[PDB]
Amino acid sequence: RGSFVEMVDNLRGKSGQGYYVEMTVGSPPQTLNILVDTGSSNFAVGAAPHPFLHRYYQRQLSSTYRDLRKGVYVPYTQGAWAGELGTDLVSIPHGPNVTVRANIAAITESDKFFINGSNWEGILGLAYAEIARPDDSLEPFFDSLVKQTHVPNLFSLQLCGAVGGSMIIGGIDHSLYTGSLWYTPIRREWYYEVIIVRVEINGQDLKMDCKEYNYDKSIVDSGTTNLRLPKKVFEAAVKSIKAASSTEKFPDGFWLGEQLVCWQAGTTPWNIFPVISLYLMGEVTNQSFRITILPQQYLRPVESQDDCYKFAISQSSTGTVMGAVIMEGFYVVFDRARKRIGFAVSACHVHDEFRTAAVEGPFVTLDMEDCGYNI
Ligand SMILES: C[C@H](O)c1cn(C[C@H](O)[C@H](Cc2ccccc2)NC(=O)c2cc(C(=O)N[C@H](C)c3ccc(F)cc3)cc(N(C)S(C)(=O)=O)c2)nn1
Ligand SMILES: [Cl-]
Ligand SMILES: [Cl-]
């Protein structure tokens, strides 16, 4: 009975290979499953046969498709695609009750982008126009939705790991979280860039300079699976996580994501692995808060009577990426109207009877305006 009830439970995932929402494009309607990605800013849909796609967009059957007569290519950290730009009517049947004319890239060729078995056929880039291809003149979908309709300029995501979740567009649903929401500023509107001001592994501060945790940016990115950390931070965090979980030894490759470890169904010794906290800059001077995840968020299942896991914190050379490993702990509010991102503990996050993910505050942290990187 909350007012946003019909958007609850509108996301699915097939064996953990990306969270997607149904979107209906063109006229008469063509509904496709679209991956939700807050790490990019193009709306693009498979528009030609591919071995991994069950369905694709057929422009010649949509009477409202308009050709913008321009190609587009988008490379990501993983994979890339190429296609043709146009516009068409778009609605989200378990989203807001509106229809907008949005730009759409029709994917005609791709490399290592579509994932076999994932059940999604396109991508919804929810970040800002600064990072869209071919350039920032190509209005992203959520910008079209806010400009064309009354829908408030905010959306929130609850990614429920193991796969489903909720994308609430235009508000917050209080059933999806417990405790209070705590907000960090969006530093700049391009990616959803935030500032991380301290990192702890089981209560123990990693003690790096905060400028290392944000070198060269820290972003919130639902289309990236892992928590990705810059080189020096990743090396330092692995050394600390190893030291904390030293009652069991694992091969070096397990911490590089190259070996899996499996336990008999139901027996994974979660308690031997530490919690991990990131402190983020708060909304008042000198004030911060911390979000804490469990090994149930950073050890991810790979699908016998065997539970196999991959360690899903990994190295980046393009900054901190708070991917699904972070987002599955939390209900995350992308309050674009107030230029801030809110975290609360997710009502669906995976935990055990001893430990829960957490969002706590306030803490005092001085000189946070010096943590960010300057281009
Ligand atoms: C604007 C810019 O240039 C850009 C932005 N991004 C980050 C985007 O989120 C892109 C979007 C995307 C979505 C599907 C397939 C390929 C790429 N994401 C990635 O580049 C990406 C995508 C993935 C990936 O497997 N994503 C899948 C769909 C996924 C699977 C589970 C899940 F919970 C969430 C996402 C993994 C990674 N890594 C490098 S990793 C092993 O460290 O987690 C990166 N990269 N470059
Ligand atoms: Cl129609
Ligand atoms: Cl990434």
Q: Which domains does the chain have, with CATH numbers?
A: 19-151 (2.40.70.10), 152-375 (2.40.70.10)
Angle, alpha carbons 215-239-318 (nearest 5°) = 20
From atom 1 of ligand 1, which residue's Cα is the shortest distance away? 40
Query: How far, in Å, from the CA of 318 to the mean position of ligand 3?
Result: 8
For residue 236, give Cα distances in angstroms to 70, 230, 241: 46, 10, 9
| Interatomic CA distance for residues 9 and 175, integer angstroms | 11
174-187 burial string, b = 16+ CB within 10 Å, else e? eebbeeebbbbbbb
From atom 27 of ligand 1, which residue's Cα is the shortest distance away? 18
Residues in the chain: 375
CB of 121 closer than 6 angstroms to any ligand 1 atom = no
Ligand nearest to the CA of 79: 1
| Interatomic CA distance for residues 240 and 40, integer angstroms | 32
| Interatomic CA distance for residues 366 and 57, integer angstroms | 51
Residues whose CB is less than 8 angstroms from the CB of residue 68 and which lie 6 or more positions away in sequence, other chains included: 84, 85, 86, 87, 103
Alpha helix positions (H), 149-230: 210-213
* Final resolution, Å: 1.7
CB of 39 closer than 6 angstroms to any ligand 1 atom = yes
From atom 45 of ligand 1, which residue's Cα is the shortest distance away? 76
Ligand nearest to the CA of 30: 2
The number of C-alpha atoms within 13 Å of 322 and in the hemisphere containing its C-beta is 28
Cα of 43 vs its chain's centroid, Å:
15
Tell me phi and psi for residue 334, to 5 degrees.
-95, 80
Beta bridge partners of 329: none
Cβ contacts of 69-73, under 8 Å, gap ≥ 24: 70/134, 72/42, 72/44, 72/105, 72/133, 72/134, 72/138, 73/133
CB of 229 closer than 6 angstroms to any ligand 1 atom = no
From atom 4 of ligand 1, which residue's Cα is the shortest distance away? 76
The technique is X-ray
Decide: residue 208, CB within 10 A, 0-12 exposed, 13-18 middle, 19+ buried. Answer: middle
* DSSP state at residue 34: E
| Interatomic CA distance for residues 158 and 163, integer angstroms | 11
CB of 35 closer than 6 angstroms to any ligand 1 atom = yes
- What spatial distance separates the first Cα and last Cα of the chain, rounded to whole Å? 47
From atom 42 of ligand 1, which residue's Cα is the shortest distance away? 226
CB of 228 closer than 6 angstroms to any ligand 1 atom = yes
- Report which ligand 1 atom has the smallest distance to the Cα of 41: 1
| Interatomic CA distance for residues 20 and 68, integer angstroms | 26
Ligand 1 probe mutation, 41, 50, 76, 221, most atoms within 8 A of CB: 76
Query: Amino acid letter at 103?
Result: N
Q: Which residues are catalytic?
A: 37, 221
CB of 17 closer than 6 angstroms to any ligand 1 atom = yes
CB of 315 closer than 6 angstroms to any ligand 1 atom = no
Ligand nearest to the CA of 190: 1
CB atoms within 10 A of CB 21: 23
* DSSP state at residue 275: P
